[PDB]
Nucleic acid binder design. Sequence first.
RNA 1: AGCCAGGAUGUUGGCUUAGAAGCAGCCAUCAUUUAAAGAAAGCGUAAUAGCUCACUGGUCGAGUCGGCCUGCGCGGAAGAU
Lengths: 141, 94, 111, 176, 136, 38
Amino acid sequence: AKKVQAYVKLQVAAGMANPSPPVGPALGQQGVNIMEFCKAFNAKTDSIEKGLPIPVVITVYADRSFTFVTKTPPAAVLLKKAAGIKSGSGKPNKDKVGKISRAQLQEIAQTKAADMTGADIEAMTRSIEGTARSMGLVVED
Amino acid sequence: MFTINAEVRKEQGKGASRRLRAANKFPAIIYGGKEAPLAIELDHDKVMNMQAKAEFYSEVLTIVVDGKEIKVKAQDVQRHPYKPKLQHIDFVRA
Amino acid sequence: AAMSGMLSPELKQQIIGLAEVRDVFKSPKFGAIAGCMVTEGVVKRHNPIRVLRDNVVIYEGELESLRRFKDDVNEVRNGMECGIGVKNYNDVRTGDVIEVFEIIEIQRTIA
Amino acid sequence: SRVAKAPVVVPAGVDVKINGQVITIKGKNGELTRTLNDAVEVKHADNTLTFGPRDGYADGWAQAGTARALLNSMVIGVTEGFTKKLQLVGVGYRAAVKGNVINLSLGFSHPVDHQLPAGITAECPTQTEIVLKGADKQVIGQVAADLRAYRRPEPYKGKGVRYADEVVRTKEAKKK
Amino acid sequence: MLQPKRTKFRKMHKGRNRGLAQGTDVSFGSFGLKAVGRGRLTARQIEAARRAMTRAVKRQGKIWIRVFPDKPITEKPLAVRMGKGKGNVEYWVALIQPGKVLYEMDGVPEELAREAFKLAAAKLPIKTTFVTKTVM
Amino acid sequence: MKVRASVKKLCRNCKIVKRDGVIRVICSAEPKHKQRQG
RNA sequence: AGCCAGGAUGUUGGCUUAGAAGCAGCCAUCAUUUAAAGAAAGCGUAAUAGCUCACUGGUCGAGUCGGCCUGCGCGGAAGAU
């Protein structure tokens, strides 16, 4: 949260090695090296495990390569591995489709290192639930 | 609750009734019980604003004529063919 | 340019006229003459027609003879009594409507 | 009505002499003399001027709002003075001034020489820029329109003469 | 198109469109379209206005048709002399007087009711106006 | 500019004005919305 | 009605997805932080957008907004000696 001039976020997955057909040169025209993307991303993110896709800011003006720090993934990507079905939209409102419990996506939503809206824990519980029910799921909470 | 100012009609027939419509008025009648029918003239613009509410046709109306409060209820209303206007209204003593 | 010319596209099949037939007559040559009354447009000789009954097309073809009385005029306007007959059409029934339509070519360009 | 009700104010040094419907306004930079419509009545009192309608006229208040706005622009005109900055854009567009006449080349076969009427004076600090200045809001607007009248910008690129506050919104070249 | 399935007689006289209308208010639905002007409404005209109101609202509520042609109107073709019997029925029309409700609607908002009847009103030959369900 | 009997406000940026004895539509946003003989 | 600002978070919204991060597509049209800000308004991008709007704060300080009934007018309204 600063200003314009190079601030962009796009990816396919954390587990990927940045191949050409999924993203390649279609990530954009910057000047920052695409080989060096596999250095500072592969300093922190790869260190333990890489389950989910993660976006990030650029913040570069005059000096060589990207100087950014990685942040947390979205909530939509948490609806595949640790919740249930990956996509299965089909016809969302013609039936109940799938479901999520109150205990599910509670401890997973709070895995975010350092980013929130408001100090209240009860507020942030159902904030991350907002990305859920967009695919026409049922609420059992 | 609903107060309506009224006056006794001097003349009768369509000739008088059509003259009242040009002057922003309209004819009316109050009947029922032992009391005989009374011919009544009412203001177009005053009654048009009151009838817009749904409580006009449901609740009891107190007509004031010659210094006399008579309680009546609305029975039938002859509306104008195409314009939002009135022709004649039937009142019942209650 | 050589390629653009090669193209042969006609994009218009607009009706020239629409007519309803009544009181069929018999002819030796075409086998039938269907009396008609044009409700809209102008009926022409060599322009193709679409014969339909109850919104579905019973038969299709191109007019061979357009004849009113003994005049045999090549053109009939709307709301003027008209006469019609065609070869290879066996059954004439009242209430159906014949749709005549002109054929035009839009032309094509390469790109 | 809402304009005319507000009293306009004259700064220090501004002399206002009212012989009749004609109103002479003078100050630091130049002197102007307009003529009122005759429907309006103007009152001079203290360090301000006030406007309003007169009896026996249909227009009434609507003309008093103009008479204020004309005389209000004269007060800023005689003291402060207005400015109109019109920049040229594109290839082969240069601007200069020689005395009272402005010599402009807008890619034509011959140079365009525009005469400045009244006491309007201009200067070109940059070759692609023209800065007009004058004590009349009427003439500075009209003279600025005459420069833009020679070359009206086509909005595919945005070349030609434009105002400083104006915005030229371009579009694409379609497809073959 | 609206037309009679059967009739006792094939043709009808010209008649007149004199006198006033009967149905001052909407009995069936909630909102509707009233005829201000005086004239007639053909089968194609009645069909065309019904499509435009239904097309704007897509598929919701319900539409009642208070009018119906009922009257066979003949025409005489070109290049034909006068007399020699009466013509043939090209179309059906309804005699519309001032006060007739032409169309009706229920189970929608009042905002969309104005839009649907305004588009329907333009197809009609005669002048029309919006009307509301009056109690009693 | 289009010219026709009826004139209507197409977008919010359009404006109806009266010049001489003819009604016009002035739209700064979209020049296609210009109209005459209203 | 002008003028000085803000214009967000779930959220780059899951998605029959090459690419979508609002838009011809998909669907519900729910849900945090907040003075107020829509999975939505658009001239409209190679994707980020650049920008402006609904909505809201400050400034200014008294009328303002548009339906109904109705008089007289306006455009629509171009022909040949």
